[PDB]
């Protein structure tokens, strides 16, 4: 069965990027929108939208630069079988700072830099490079 | 407020106080709103030709910007200060808040 919707999002982006898909459809959720919302500020995705009320659908517009996938790599860090939590001093650097780490802190989901500036730890959701 | 480009040189045997010297010049320059807006340094360098027997000496660059009067005092200091072997108070039209090849090489 489907047990980690977040990893499904990573596969949906990764498979669509490798298949040169213009857009991807998926069931929506607050966390999925929040992660898609975070992606917007760094330019990894073009736009996101939410349609439907009883069964919300999250729609992501993929982005390409020279006909090549914008999302070079993305991999799940915290998983249902193995949760990963990092303290503020030990927060990892993803793609030597060029990429971002989606971090779920007590003040909501933010990037590694936002957590680093605010001096906060949390759950490392994913690595983006 | 004319932009000057000091380039003095300090005896290789007195690089210990070179820092302190920077402070002295900077402090008096800043007294008349002497915007420094640049303070590089090339430490010691192998002089091309043996000036004053000294086959090697320090090297400092200060693209400062201060009134004409204050800077003139600096030249008097550099003249009667044995530590500074040679100077070159050039005068640039504008400012250079960047970097030179002498540091970008490393």
């Amino acid at each position: 069965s489907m047990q980690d919707p977040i990893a499904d999002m990573l596969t949906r982006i990764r498979n669509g990027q490798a298949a040169n898909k213009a857009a991807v459809t998926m069931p929506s959720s607050k966390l999925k929108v929040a992660i898609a919302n975070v992606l917007k500020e760094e330019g990894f995705i073009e736009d996101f939208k939410v349609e439907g009320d009883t069964k919300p659908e999250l729609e992501l517009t993929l982005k390409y630069f020279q006909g090549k996938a914008v999302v070079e790599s993305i991999q799940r860090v915290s998983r249902p079988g193995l949760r990963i939590y990092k303290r503020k001093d030990e927060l990892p650097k993803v793609m030597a700072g060029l990429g971002i780490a989606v971090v779920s802190t007590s003040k909501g989901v933010m990037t590694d830099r936002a957590a680093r500036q605010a001096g906060l730890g949390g759950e490392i959701i994913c690595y983006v490079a | 407020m004319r932009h000057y480009e000091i380039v003095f040189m300090v005896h290789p045997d007195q690089s210990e106080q070179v820092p302190g010297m920077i402070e002295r010049y900077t402090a008096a320059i800043t007294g008349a709103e002497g915007k420094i807006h640049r303070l590089e340094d090339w430490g010691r360098r192998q002089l091309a030709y043996p000036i004053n027997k000294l086959h090697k000496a320090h090297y400092v660059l200060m693209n400062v910007e201060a009134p004409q009067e204050v800077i003139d005092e600096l030249e008097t200091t550099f003249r009667f200060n044995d530590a500074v072997i040679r100077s070159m108070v050039m005068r640039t039209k504008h400012a250079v808040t960047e970097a030179s090849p002498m540091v970008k090489a490393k």
């Binding site: 990894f44 793609m95 030597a96 700072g97 060029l98 | -």
Partner: protein, 158 residues
């Protein structure tokens, strides 16, 4: 300029009706030491020639690597046909820390300080291709800001 390094030579052989026909191969990398490196491979009956075949092979098929003051820009992972390589940028003064095959490419490429490790098969020819492939995928802040449609200062954060 153009610097030349011999990485490894070998005596391959194909049996023929009469007997064993021995041949020699040669692996080389050329580069200007300032962000450009190219590998070469050549087979010939005489070792002298094999080198020329490798030199011509290295002259063609060249790639650009975005160096950063004679050091890598970020840790990179390369994999080619069973050889896995890991290279990490290092501070100034550490020199080249790599195996014999991995070391040779870095001088012509212009890398001065790097920590490298070869996992899996250490076959010299596969190892060399693994390093170059990682270097080709290595991007600099200038193209990353353009590719992400952002500015350098914002993404860097300084």
């Amino acid at each position: 300029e153009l610097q030349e390094k011999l990485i490894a030579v070998n005596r391959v052989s194909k049996t023929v009706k009469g007997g064993r026909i021995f041949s020699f191969t040669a692996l080389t990398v050329v580069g200007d030491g300032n962000g450009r490196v190219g590998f070469g491979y050549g087979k010939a009956r005489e070792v002298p020639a094999a080198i020329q075949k490798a030199m011509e092979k290295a002259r063609r098929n060249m790639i650009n690597v975005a160096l950063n003051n004679g050091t890598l820009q970020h840790p990179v992972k390369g994999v080619h046909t069973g050889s896995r390589v890991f290279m990490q940028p290092a501070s100034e003064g550490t020199g080249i820390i790599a195996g014999g095959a991995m070391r040779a490419v870095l001088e012509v490429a212009g890398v001065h300080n790097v920590l490298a490790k070869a996992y899996g098969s250490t076959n010299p020819i596969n190892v060399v291709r693994a390093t170059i492939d990682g270097l080709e995928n290595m991007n600099s802040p200038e193209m990353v800001a353009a590719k992400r449609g952002k500015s350098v200062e914002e993404i860097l954060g300084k």
